[PDB]
């Protein structure tokens, strides 16, 4: 069976400003089949209250989902998105980079 691995982008809803509340996003897309595991990480630890969009898909049939949680960026705290999917041998981690 043909499968497609997820693309992953980690970014903030609004331009990041330290000390100002914002939303951390992890957008997974272009994947098939639809089952997928996504965690948002703060300093390597899983963030608890993460919400996500309803499952939908693109014109090429690949699925996409937005995972998001409120966060307040600081200079020191590290954020990332951790993704697993049938196409991945082990979870893929993408760090949040405020310039990306």
């Amino acid at each position: 069976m043909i499968q497609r691995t997820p693309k992953i982008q980690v970014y903030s809803r609004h331009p990041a400003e330290n000390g100002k509340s914002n939303f951390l996003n992890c957008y997974v897309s272009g994947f098939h089949p639809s089952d997928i595991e996504v965690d948002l990480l703060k300093n390597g630890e899983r963030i608890e209250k993460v919400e996500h969009s309803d499952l939908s898909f693109s014109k090429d049939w690949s699925f996409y989902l937005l995972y998001y949680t409120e966060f307040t960026p600081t200079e020191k705290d590290e954020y990332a998105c951790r993704v697993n999917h049938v196409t991945l041998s082990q979870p893929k981690i993408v760090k949040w980079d405020r310039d990306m």
Partner: protein, 276 residues
């Protein structure tokens, strides 16, 4: 001024873990407005945009009956397709359907769409005539023959030219303050040396709606298609979208590069440069 409505159905089997999950979501353009999930504690059609909340109980109940019945039909369909491909009962499979109507800037029907896929591959699609089918393989031909026998295309056509257009027009009016509002991108260009002799220029578009946009780099007025790193347009979570395009340039040549931005919400196309 052009608009579309789409419903996206996903039916997913999962042997050993209950019956196939059926989800349906509805969109006008890039705005989701409803959902139904057979896995919800209490499956029912739920509003996902404020302008749909005004529809009355009859609407929600009508939708819910439709999606509950589709839930059962798609489970039958999954059983059928597993057999069409001689597949074992061990594996999980997915049928997807996306359908709907497009209106031109005058609110007239431009065309209808009704396409299905199995395990992520084209399976069967209604042609633009809304009267004939295109089947991807000999399995889909079985579906085609069954749908031709039952005059299913006629049913799709009546919907696509009738209720689809009627309700899309209703939604566009009810949600006119947002659905018919294009928000232009907020843009800027960043500069990051990558070494003594090269630097990255990144052209940003933020806060725009709808998602459709064109973001390109030119050098001396020539498109830099191959040299441009282009990320997928991505949702901000406030209805708006984001995108960037990056190119790595020789240090000192920054002013030879221009970023061009086209978007519906823009008074006029933008050309931007790095501004030290």
């Amino acid at each position: 001024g052009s608009h579309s409505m789409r419903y996206f159905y996903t039916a997913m089997s999962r042997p050993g873990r209950g019956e196939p999950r059926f989800i349906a979501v509805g969109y006008v353009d890039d705005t989701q407005f409803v959902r139904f999930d057979s896995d919800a504690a209490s499956p029912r059609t739920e509003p996902r945009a404020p302008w749909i909340e005004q529809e009355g109980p009859e609407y929600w109940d009508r939708n819910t009956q439709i999606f509950k019945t589709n839930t059962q039909t798609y489970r039958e369909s999954l059983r059928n397709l597993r057999g069409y491909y001689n597949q074992s009962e061990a594996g999980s499979h997915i049928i997807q359907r996306m359908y709907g109507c497009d209106l031109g800037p005058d609110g007239r029907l431009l065309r209808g769409h009704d396409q299905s896929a199995y395990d992520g591959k084209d399976y069967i699609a209604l042609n633009e005539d809304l009267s004939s089918w295109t089947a991807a393989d000999t399995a889909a031909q079985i579906t085609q023959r069954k749908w031709e026998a039952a005059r299913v295309a006629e049913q799709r056509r009546a919907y696509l030219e009738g209720l689809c257009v009627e309700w899309l027009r209703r939604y566009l009016e009810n949600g006119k303050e947002t659905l018919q509002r294009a928000d232009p991108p907020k843009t800027h260009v960043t500069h990051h040396p990558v070494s003594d002799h090269e630097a990255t220029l990144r052209c940003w578009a933020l806060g725009f709606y709808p998602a459709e946009i064109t973001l390109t780099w030119q050098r001396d007025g020539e498109d830099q298609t191959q040299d441009t790193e282009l990320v997928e347009t991505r949702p901000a979570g406030d209805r708006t979208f984001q995108k960037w395009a990056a190119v790595v340039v020789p240090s000192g040549e920054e002013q030879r590069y221009t970023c061009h931005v086209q978007h519906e919400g823009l008074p006029k196309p933008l050309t931007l440069r790095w501004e030290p």
